[model samples]
Target chain A: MIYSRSKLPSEGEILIATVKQVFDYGSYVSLDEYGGLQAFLPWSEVSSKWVKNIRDVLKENRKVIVKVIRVDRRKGTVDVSLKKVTDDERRKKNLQWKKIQRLDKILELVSQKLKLSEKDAWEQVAWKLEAKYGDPITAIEKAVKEGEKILIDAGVPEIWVKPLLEEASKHAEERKVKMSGLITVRTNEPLGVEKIKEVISKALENIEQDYESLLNIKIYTIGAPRYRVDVVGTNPKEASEALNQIISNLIKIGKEENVDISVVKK
Target chain B: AWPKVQPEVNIGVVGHVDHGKTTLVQAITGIWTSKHSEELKRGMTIKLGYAETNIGVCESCKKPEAYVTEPSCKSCGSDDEPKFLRRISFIDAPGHEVLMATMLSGAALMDGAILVVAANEPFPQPQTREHFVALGIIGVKNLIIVQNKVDVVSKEEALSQYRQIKQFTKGTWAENVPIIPVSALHKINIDSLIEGIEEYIKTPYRDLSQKPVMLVIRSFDVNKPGTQFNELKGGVIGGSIIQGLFKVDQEIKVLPGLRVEKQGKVSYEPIFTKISSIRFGDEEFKEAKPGGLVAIGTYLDPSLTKADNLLGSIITLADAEVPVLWNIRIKYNLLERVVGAKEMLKVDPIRAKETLMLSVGSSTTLGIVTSVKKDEIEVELRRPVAVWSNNIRTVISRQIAGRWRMIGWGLVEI
Candidate 1:
C-alpha cells in the first residue's frame, strides 16, 4: 500500500509476494506492496523442477520474488511463477524492496521526531520530496551522499533531515553467521548466589571481549539453571571457533570452581 | 532443535533407462530430478536427483493426498488441509547402464523405492532386474511398482506388462506390493501412484537420542564465485541421516574423512568439525533426525567439500567411534549371474589379488581381493565403508570390468 502501486501487476512483471497458504494445486500469496492483493501460484509454476514438498517450496508468511504470468480480471486473480522469474530479476526486486522498507522506517522516525501523525508526515514531506525528485528514497540518500543542500533543496523539514540521515546511515549489511550452545551450571555450595554470579559476570565479559571484535555474544536464561550462549559472528568459521572457545572457557571455569557443569553445543 | 511432533522418511525413485523415473518424480513432486546440464543435454540422468514432499489428508475430501508436494489440496480448492502425515524425501537415481554405481550407492540410503517400469514398453528391462537385485542386496524391502507410460499402452498389452512384472516380483520381497499404473508424461493415473507410495512406504521409527551416524552423499562448496573471505562459509555435506540425530553447532567426527598423503601412501584421516547449519531439503532445521536428506554446513575447509570430494564420508558424534575399514573380510551369497552389463554372463569366481569395484553406503571404491575362499573373501579397499555389522552397512561388489558388473554382496564377518 505504501508503494502506491496498482493492485494488479502486469504479466511478466516481478513483484514481492508473501506465501499465505500452500496446497497441492497451487500456493496463495498476498502481494505486500499491493494492499495484500492475493494471487495464485500453481505448483507447476512454483519452480522449474519437480516440487517434492510444498512446505519446502513455500512457508506461511515467507516473502518470495515471483514473476506474474496471468491476470484474470474477471475472477480477480493474478498468477505468478516461482521458476520463471530470473535470478537477476529476483535480486533487483529484493534490493529495491529492502530500500523501500528501510526508507519507510526513516519516514516513521520522522513522524515520531516531528510529533506529527504518520499521514501528516507523509503528506507534508514525502510527497513534496517525491514531487521534486523521481524517488524520495534516492533524494534522502543524496543528502547523505551529496550534501545537506539536497535536503534543503527539497525543503525537507529541517528537524526531519537530521533524523533521516541518522536512520539512513544505519543501513549496513547484516551478519549471517551464528553459533550457539546450551550451558548448565550447578554447585553444591549452600551460598549459590556468589558462585552463579561469578559465572554470569564472566559470561558478560565474553560478550565485551575486545579481541573477538566481530563477535557479539549474547546470553539468555532459557530456563532456571540453564543459560543459552549465542555468538553471532561475521562468518561461519569465525562463529565456529569463537563459540567453541566460549563454551570451553565456561566449562573450564565451572570445573575449577568445583561446580557441576554441562555444556551441550547444538 | 528438529521441528517437533513430526516424523520424516525418504523414498527413492529408480528403474531402467528412459522409463520416466524422473518424470514420475515430477508428477509426484513437481520438481525435475535432472538438475545437471550434462544429464539434461545428454537426454539421460547422469547423477542422482533428489526432491521431497509432504503427504497429508484433505480435510474436505477426507482422502489422502499421497504426494502433495505443494501446500494446498488439489481435490478441493480448500486451504483446510488435514493432519500432516509424513515428510517424504525422494532420491532420484540415474537408470543408465553405465551409471549403476550411482544407482546402487543411492539404494543404500533408500528405505523404500518406487521401481518405475514403462507399460508402453515391455516390463523388466535388464536394468530393471538389475535395479531390483541391487535393492535386494542393499536390504531395501519396501517397494512400490510404478507402471508408467500407461496411456500409451493397450489394456491387453498392459496386462502382459503386468504379468511380466508379477513373474519378476512374485516370490521376492516385492511380492504383494502395490503396482500403480501411471503415465508420467500425460499425468494419467498419477493419483494411483501417489496413493501407492503412502500405503507401501512407511517411515521407520528412529531414536533421536542414539549416537548419530550420517552417510555423506553429496558434499560441495556452497559459496558463490568471488565470495568475500569474511562471508565465506565452510564445506557442506549432503546426505540422509541414517541413524540418530544431529544439531547445528554439534561437533561431528567424520571418519575416513580426507585422504591425506603420508609417506607417499594415502592415509585416511578423521576430521573434526562443528555443524554450522542443517537443511532438511525442504526447510532449514536447528536439528536433523533420520529419514530425510539433510545438508550439514560444517566449519570445514571449503576445498575439502568442493565437487563432492568428501562424499561417502561417515559423519558421527565427535565422541562416538564408528568402524573405519581399509580391509574387510565378509562371507556373502554369490549370485548365479552378473547383471547390468551389456552382456549377461555367469558370475566368475573371485580370485586372490583380483580387483573388484565395491559399493558401500554412498561410497564406491576398488576392493582388491586379498584372500578368496568359496563362500567368503577378504578385500582391501582404497575408500572406506562405515559400520562393520552396523547392519545399516550393506556392502556390494562387482568385477572391475569395462563396466562394473554386479557379482554379489559381501556381508561383514568381522
Candidate 2:
C-alpha cells in the first residue's frame, strides 16, 4: 500500500501479491499494494516447466512476486505471470518492498513525534522527499547521514524535519548478520574418538567463553562426523571473521588431536 | 552434554489414554511432546508428538543399569563419561479411542513401538487392545512392552500386572518381548527401558540405493505472525523416510497432493517441490536418510502447508515411480474377533458394497468393497492413496458400535 500510485499495476511491472484462490489450471491473486485488486495467473505462466498441479506451485494466502503481463484498465483485469519474474528481479523487488514498508513506519513515527496527522505528515514530508530523491527511504537516509538541512533544502516542512531525522537515525544503525556452515571432523588414530570429541568441545567452549558477549555461536551435530555451526553479530565483517576464526580453531584443535577437518558454508 | 545427532531409527510410544505414554517419552527424551494449544489446554495429545534422545552406555556399569540418557554415568557415582550410543526418535500417539486412526497412521512411521501398560489398571484396556492389534496389522515386528506407573502400586501388584501383560501377549509376536517396569513420572527404571529398546528394536537395513520415499506425517508454515514478507521461512514437512536418501536442493514430488474438483467430479493431482533444507531433530543437515523422523523445508509457499494441509501425502524424488491407487485389490486377513469391542463380537467376513476405512502409511481413506474372494478383496477408495508396491500393509477397520474398530489387515494384490 505504500508504493503503488494507481489502483492497478502497469504491464510488465513486477509486484507483490498474495494467492487468493488456486485451481488446477490457474490461480487468482490479489495485489498487495493496489487495494487488493484481483489478477489471474494461468498455469502456463506459473513455471517454465509444466505444472501438473497449480496448488503445489501456489497456495492460498501465500505471498509471491509476479510480473504483470497484461493490464486492461477498462475491464479492470490484470494478468500476471510467475515465470516472467526472474529470481534476481524478485530479490531486488523484495528489498525495495522492505524499504518502502520501513519508510511507512518511520513516517508514522515522525507524525506521532511532531503531533501532526499521519496524512499531513506524508503529504508535507514523505511525498516531497519521494519526488526529490525518488525514494523516501533514501531521502530519509540522506537526512540522517548528511543533516536535517538536506530535508530543509528540499523544502520539506520545518515541523516534520527534526522528528523524521531523529526517528530515522535510530533505525539507520547497522543490523545483525548471521553466517552458518557445516563442519566435519574425523580421526584415524586408535582410541581417537574421545580425543577428537574432547578437542572439538574444548575449542567450542573456549570460543564461547571468550566471545560470550560479542557473538552468538550455535553448534550442533548433524550426524556422527558432521556438525552445523552458526555465528551472529551486528557487523558483517565481525560475524564473518568470527565464523572463520571458529573454523580455523576447530582445524587447529583437530590437527593437535591428529584429526581431519572440513567445512561447507551455508 | 553430549552432542546432538540424527536419530538412527524411529520408535513409537502407544497404549491406552492416561496410561503415561507421553510421560514415558518425557522420561527418556526430556521433552513433553504434546505442545499444541488444544493439547496443552485439554491435557491430552491430539496430534502425533515427536522427540529424540541419544542412548549412552557405561562400560564399568552392569547390563540394563549401564544404559542412560545422559553422557555421564550416574549409577556408580563415577566421574567417567559414558560412551555415546545411537540416537532414537520417539513418536508419541494419542491413546483415546477416537484417535485410533491417528495411532494407526503413526504406526507407519515406526520401525518399532513400545506398548505402555499401566501397572494399577486392568489388563487389555480397550484402547490398549486396539493399539496392539493395530500395530500387529501394520506388521510392526519389533515391539517392547512397558509396565508403567510401578510407583503407584505395590510390588506384588506390579508383578500381577506384569503377569497379566504376559497373558495378554501370549501366542502373539510380543509374547517373548521384555516388559520393563518403570515409573515415568518418577523416572525410575528408564535406563532398563532404553536397554530393552536397544536390544529388541535393532535398526533395519536401509536400502540407500533405491529412490527416496517419505510418508508425510506433519506439515506447517514455519513463519511466525507479523513476520516480514521477505523474512518469512519456507513451508516445513515432517515425517520419516522408509527408504533411500534425500539431499538438500533435490526436487521431489508429492502424490495425491492437491484436491481438484470439476463438474461434480473430484480428483487429486500430484505436486512438485524442491527441498530447501533437511532437518533431523533440531539440527539442520545437508542430507537425510531412512531412519528417523525428518523435517524438510520446501521452496513452496508457507500457506500451502499450514495446518497440515499436506498431511498424508507421499514424497519422492522427481521422476520416481509412485503408484496412485483409486481401486486397490488386496489380499485380506481378518482377525478372529473385533478389537476394542466391549462384547466378544466375531468379525464377519468382508462383503461386497460394505464401507470400510483403510489405513495405509499415514493416509486413511474410506473405501467400498466391490468384489470379494476367499482370501482377497477389491476396494474402490473414495480418495486415492499412493502405494509404491504390492507388499505395503493396509490396516482395515469397520464401523462397529458406532466406532471404527480394527478388524484385520490386507496387502495389495501384485
Candidate 3:
C-alpha cells in the first residue's frame, strides 16, 4: 500500500478554491486538486516580512495557487503550501500535474498501436515504467529514445517499453548532472594504443545515445592521458549511473579488442 | 564469525622525538596536534591525535594536494573546499619509546604506518629502527618512510639514511617502502610524499559506503533539572562512528544491558549543553559514515549511561566476546560508579560513566565489574549474558574525572 506519488504535477492543475477559514497560524483554502483538498498558507510563511493581520492579505472565498505538499490516502490529508512560491516552482508543479493527465490520453494512443484497450495498455505501460525508471515519465522517455533496451535490462516485457519510450522521447528532455574524472586506457598489442583511443572516443560519443534524454554527456580533454567526462542534468543520481554504464560498456568493448583500461574519478 | 566485519582502517604516524611526526602530519593533513594546552605546555605532542586530508585532482593544477580545510574530517570538503579527497585519517602518536606500548595499542588499529624519521638523525637511534620493526610485527603492510629534516642534512646524508632504512626494515612490510626525503622545516618534498601516500593509500576494508556505526567515546548530561521528558532527562552522547551509517531519527541500540530503546536525531540548532551539536571535524553531517568520529545528542538522561556503553546498530554479534580473564585490558581512563545492564552490554564511550541497558539478540543481563587489576580485571556480570563462550569477557572502564577521561579498563568474565 506504500506507493509514491508523482513528484510532478499533472494537467487540470488550475483550480478554483475558497478560503474556508482563517486563523492566527495560517489560512485554510479548499482546492479541487484532490477533490476539494484543503491547502494552508501560514501567516508567517505568507510574506517575506511580518503581516499585521490575516485579513490584510486574504479573506473568505479567496482563490490562489496552492502547491500540493503531500496527499495521504489513509489519513486523507492533502497538505498544500502557497507562500513564497517561485515562478520556477509553479511552472514545474503545473507541468508535472499536466503530464500525469496527458499520460492517460497518451496511453489511448498506445492502445491503438497494440490493439488493446486504453485500460489494459495503461496498466501494462505503468507497470513497465515503474519497474524500469521508478518514474513513469522517465521510463516512457527512455523507451522512445533508446528503444526497449532499458526496459529489457530492467526485466520488463519487450513488447511494451520499446514503443512506450519511443513515444515519450518526443516530449522529454534528458536530465543529468555534471561529473568529470580521469580515464587512462593502455594496451600491450602493437595496434592496441590506437584501438584503445578509438574505443575511448567511441565510448564518449555513445554516452548520449545510450542514456537518451536522461543525460547530456560531454567529454573534454583535461590533458594528455586524462580526459574529463562531464554530464549535465537534473538528476545527479541518474547522470552518474548513466556515465558509469557508458564507461563499463566501453571497457567491455575494449577488452574484446585486447586493450587494458583503468578509469578513476578526479 | 559475523562476516569478520573489518575494523575501520586509519593511517597513523609513529617515530622518535623531534622526528617531524607531528609536523609531517600537520603539513599533509593541515592539522597541528600540538596545539592542545597540555601538549603546548609540554612543548611536545601528547595523546593520540587525528586529522583527515582530502585527496583530489587539484582544481588549478590538476594535481592532488594532501590539503584539508579543518583539523577534523567533517569540514574537509565544504564550500571552502568543494573538492573531495579520499579521506586519510592521520593519527599522530607519541615518539618516546616508553609510550610504544600505547603506540602499539593505537597502531594496532591502523591500516597503514607513516614512519617519520629525521634525515639528519642518520637513520635514527636503535629505538627508531625498532619502531619500524614494531610496525611490521603488527601486520601493518602499507608504509611510507619520510626521511625528514632535509633542511639540515645534505642530500647525500639524506639518501644514505634512506638506504639505511632498507636494512632496518628488511623482511618487514616497510622493506619495499617508498622513502621520500623531505624537510618539515623547509617544506620540501612534501608534495611528492603526499603523492606517494595517495598512490599507496589502500581503500579501507571497512566500507565507508555502508551505514555508519559510531563507537561512543564520550557522553554527558546536557539538560537542567525539571527538563525531563516524562522522567527522561536529556543527555549528549559523543563518539566516532566506527562503522555503518547513522542518520537523524534512526533507532540505535544502546548495546549491552538496558532495554531502553533510545533514539537520536541530529540537532544543529543550539540547545544549552556542554556540546550543542554533533560534529565530524567542522561539517555537520545529516548522517555520518563509517570511520567518522562524532558526538550525538540523546533524549535519555545521563544517569542511564553510567558506564562507557558503545552505541551501534541493533544487529550485533550474537555471542558478544569479552575477555573473562584479566590477561590484558585497554584503559578508558574514566571515573564513576553506577551499574545496570539489559540482556547484553551496550557500551557508549561518550557518556561519562554510565552502563547502558541493552537487549542484544534476545538475551539480557545487568553488567557489573566485580574486580580490577593494573591492566585488566574480572567482572561478575549477571547470568544470561549473550557473550561467546570462548571469549566471554568484555572491556570495562570508568571516568574518574570530569573530562570524559579513561581511568582504567577491566575484563568482564563469567
DockQ ranking of the models: 2, 1, 3
Q: For residues B319-368, could you state the per-residue lDDT of candidate 3 as single tens digits?
A: 22322221222223342331211222333443322342222212222334
Give Cα-based local distance difference scores for all models: 0.66, 0.72, 0.49
Candidate 1, position B391, lDDT: 39
C-alpha positional error of residue B108 in candidate 2 after TM-score superposition, expressed in Å: 6.0
What tens-digit string does per-residue lDDT give for candidate 1 at A1-266?
A: 35443456777888888898997688888887665788889888755555367776699999988988889878567888886778887678887787778667777776777677656666666667776877776666556656667777876667666766776655532435567777765443322324555655564464434333233566554543455767664456667676767677777776676656588545
Model 3 CAPRI rating: incorrect
Off by over 4 Å in 1: A1-266, B1-7, B17-19, B35-47, B60-69, B77-79, B95-99, B103-108, B259-267, B383-385, B388-403
Candidates sorted by lDDT, best first:
2, 1, 3
Evaluate residue B164 in candidate 1 and report its C-alpha lDDT on the 0 to 100 scale: 77
Clashes of each: 18, 0, 84
lDDT of 1 by residue, B1-414 (tens): 112322376777767647377777777766776654533441221345666666665544633443344556654456555556666777775533344465444333677878887444566666676657667766678888877766655778756777877888777767887777777687656766766777778776666777787777667766554343335456678766777878887877777766677887887767777788887653577988777667788766555566667776678877876778788876766576664446655667778887766666666678777887776778787677667235333346654422355666655666
Best by lDDT: 2
DockQ per candidate, 2 decimals: 0.01, 0.01, 0.01
RMSD of 1: 27.0
Off by over 4 Å in 3: A1-266, B1-9, B37-47, B59-83, B94-98, B102-109, B124-127, B207-213, B221-234, B255-278, B303-414
